[PDB]
Amino acid sequence: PFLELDTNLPANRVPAGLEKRLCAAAASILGKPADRVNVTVRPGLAMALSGSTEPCAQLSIASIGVVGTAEDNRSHSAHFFEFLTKELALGQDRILIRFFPLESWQIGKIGTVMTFL
Amino acid sequence: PFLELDTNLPANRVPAGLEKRLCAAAASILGKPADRVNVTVRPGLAMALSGSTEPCAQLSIASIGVVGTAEDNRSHSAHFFEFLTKELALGQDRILIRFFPLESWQIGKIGTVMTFL
C-alpha cells in the first residue's frame, strides 16, 4: 500500500511519529505486512477541503487487491477515519479519502517490477 | 473535485488566498457546488516543466463525471489556464494540467464511501 496524506496543519501540529502509526494502522486495516506499507505526510500546505480552509487532511490510499470495491472501501474508510480524526484532532467533516487500485506491473521494487518478484 | 497544484514558486511568491480563489473557480468551471471542491497547493518545490526549471505550475484535477472526455477537458482547460496564468503571472507555456476521472466507490467521506451517501 502507498498512503499519501496532505494537510494544512503545520508540521508542529501533526503528532510526532504519525507516519509510523499510520503505517502500522494501514497494515492492520488493509491486511498487509508492515514491510509492504508506505506512508508519506506533507504538512504545512495551503488547502481547502469541502470549500473551507479550516484545518483538514486529505488521504490517498493506493494498493493491490484490497481497495477496488465500494463495500471493501466502506469498511476501510470507517477504520481510517477513526484513526485520523483522533490523531489529528479533526472532526469527521475535515478528512476525505481517495482509494486507488494498483496492479503488480505498476510497482517498481529493487530495479524490477512486482510482476517478476 | 480534488485539485492539487505543485509549483516552484516560493510560498511568498504565490498570491495569498490562491487556494480559496482556485476553489471558487473550480466550482464554477467544473459545475460543482463549492462545498464539494477540494484544493491543495504545494509551493517551493524543485520543478522542471517541458524540460525547463523556469517558474511553472502543475495542476491535477480529479473529479466524478466531468473530466472523462477530450471535449469536456478542453472546455475546462481553457478556463483553468486563464485563471492560473493571471494569478501566477505565468505564460500558458509554464502550466500543464492532468485530468483524472473518479468514481463514487473511490471517495471516502464521513467513514463510508460516496456510493452510500
Add this chain to the structure above:
Amino acid sequence: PFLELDTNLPANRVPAGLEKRLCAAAASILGKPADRVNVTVRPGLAMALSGSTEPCAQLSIASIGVVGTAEDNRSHSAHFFEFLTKELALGQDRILIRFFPLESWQIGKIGTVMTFL
C-alpha cells in the same frame, strides 16, 4: 512524462540540480524529448517506506505510451533505480516506483488538451 519524487531527505541533503539531472535521465530512459519531460521534487517530508522511516524516496512516473506493460516497466525500473540510488545516496531497499499510463485527453496544454495538438 510526469515524474514526481517525494523524499524525507531534507532539502539540504538532496544534491543541487537533482530535478535537472532527473529530467535529462528520464528523457533518455523513456525515449521522450526533453522538452516533453516534467519533474517535481518534494523534499523534507515525513515518510515510511516498507514500514521504516529511514531516509527513502518514492517516485511516480506517468506517461503516454511507454509505462503500460510489465516488460517495459521492468526495464524502466532498473534504470531509474540506478539513477536514484546514486543521486540520493540511498540503498535499493529505500526507493519504490509507481508507473501510471496517461492518454492524450488527460493532458491540458495551452488551454486545450493534447488530443487536439
